[PDB]
Design a protein around this ligand. Structure first.
Ligand SMILES: OC[C@H](O)[C@H]1O[C@H](O)C[C@@H](O)[C@@H]1O
Ligand SMILES: OC[C@H](O)[C@H]1O[C@H](O)C[C@@H](O)[C@@H]1O
Ligand SMILES: OC[C@H](O)[C@H]1O[C@H](O)C[C@@H](O)[C@@H]1O
Ligand SMILES: [Ca+2]
Ligand SMILES: [Ca+2]
Ligand SMILES: [Ca+2]
Ligand SMILES: [Ca+2]
Ligand SMILES: [Ca+2]
Ligand SMILES: [Ca+2]
Ligand SMILES: [Ca+2]
Ligand SMILES: [Ca+2]
Ligand SMILES: [Ca+2]
Lengths: 148, 145, 145
């Protein structure tokens, strides 16, 4: 009993302290939505380099799977005023975009007419400050945003 | 109750280390309050919204101790910062976002002076002193949690 | 109570996620140590003070593994960083802030050379190698916690 009483106080302290630090941590480069957290590195990089940074950090490139997640990601894009790369590509099969796992998209917010594989060479995806998506050359540099 | 005690102990140690990492170099802990700067400047309204959306509010030092902690961030970035208080409701009366009156102040000599008949916001200098300033001006964004 | 048990499990999961978020992109964990860069350069004394005030100390790689982890941050920022060690007390003998002699070193060929007759601090290059450098120079600030 005794060991349980004081233990409750310790857990309550950790919960309160943690709740506070979550807010501190996310300000101003992160966004929490559901059980997902987006965090921007604050700089731009080509797709492959951006992908590697996220994977090595224990996460992956931003992969919005719902309107709510897309809106959260859009807030970071707007704050930095820099379009960002998403994790999805159609590098394997032209015209078919997939997540790093190979799974087909469960959500998309393409701007009208997109994806258009402009110049026959756009296999990556960027999200604009207006929240819309556009396929873009993977060699271009875009804001790095990872999800955890 | 045994293995659980070991987990809680580990969490306290891990959390303490993590807190130090988080606060370096843009945060300051004082009492139960934490100040954190965004590292950039914004006009008051925008700065205020950023803090509110983050689940906090603009820096609101309520004691000499809190003011000193906030001052450290201002000195580190060498950029004066906005406080949360304004006298937008009633000229000459500065209040917190809750309407409550100030329980602490550290005005520079002669301030607040509503210069130009248009200074309803407050900035804190690198010397820790306060000055009322036009809300349209851009100052370092520092929120409290 | 089974209630506390469940709460702790979830706390561990939430904490683990926030730890990964915290380290991206300015931190690196290796073993029980965490390196975190301030993102800017400063002379040694100032860098040392920033780390000590934050409850840590300047980066002090004690193994090849720790050196590699630190190297990642230096490469990512593309800026050589200061280590904690100096030979200010006894020329030629580098020590940690505590006074203890080095237990690991990764000197670049020809180093340390005390070039100019006054290089008592240490910097780590993007290639991971070390070079003794004048303490007055400005290098990337990286602390360990
Ligand atoms: O990614 C490129 C983007 O799709 C653009 O392609 C073309 O140049 C037609 C434009 O209307 C469109 O916006
Ligand atoms: O915010 C403006 C600030 O109060 C300044 O107002 C006047 O121009 C008189 C100055 O001595 C004072 O420093
Ligand atoms: O810190 C100075 C540094 O050791 C340099 O000293 C000399 O000028 C020889 C160089 O090869 C070496 O890189
Ligand atoms: Ca293709
Ligand atoms: Ca394509
Ligand atoms: Ca396109
Ligand atoms: Ca007024
Ligand atoms: Ca006024
Ligand atoms: Ca004034
Ligand atoms: Ca010497
Ligand atoms: Ca020397
Ligand atoms: Ca040298």
């Amino acid at each position: 009993r005794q060991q349980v009483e004081a233990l409750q106080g310790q857990v309550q302290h950790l919960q309160a302290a943690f709740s506070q630090y979550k807010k501190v941590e996310l300000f101003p480069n992160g966004q929490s939505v559901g059980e997902k957290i987006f965090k921007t590195a604050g700089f731009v990089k080509p797709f492959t380099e951006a992908q590697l940074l996220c994977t090595q950090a224990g996460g992956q490139l931003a992969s919005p799977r719902s309107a709510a997640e897309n809106a959260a990601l859009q807030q970071l894009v707007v704050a930095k005023n820099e379009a960002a790369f998403l994790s999805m590509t159609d590098s394997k099969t032209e015209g078919k975009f997939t997540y790093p796992t190979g799974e087909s998209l469960v959500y998309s917010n393409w701007a009208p007419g997109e994806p258009n594989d402009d110049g026959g060479s756009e296999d990556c995806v960027e999200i604009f400050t207006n929240g819309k998506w556009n396929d873009r050359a993977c060699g271009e540099k875009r804001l790095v945003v990872c999800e955890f």
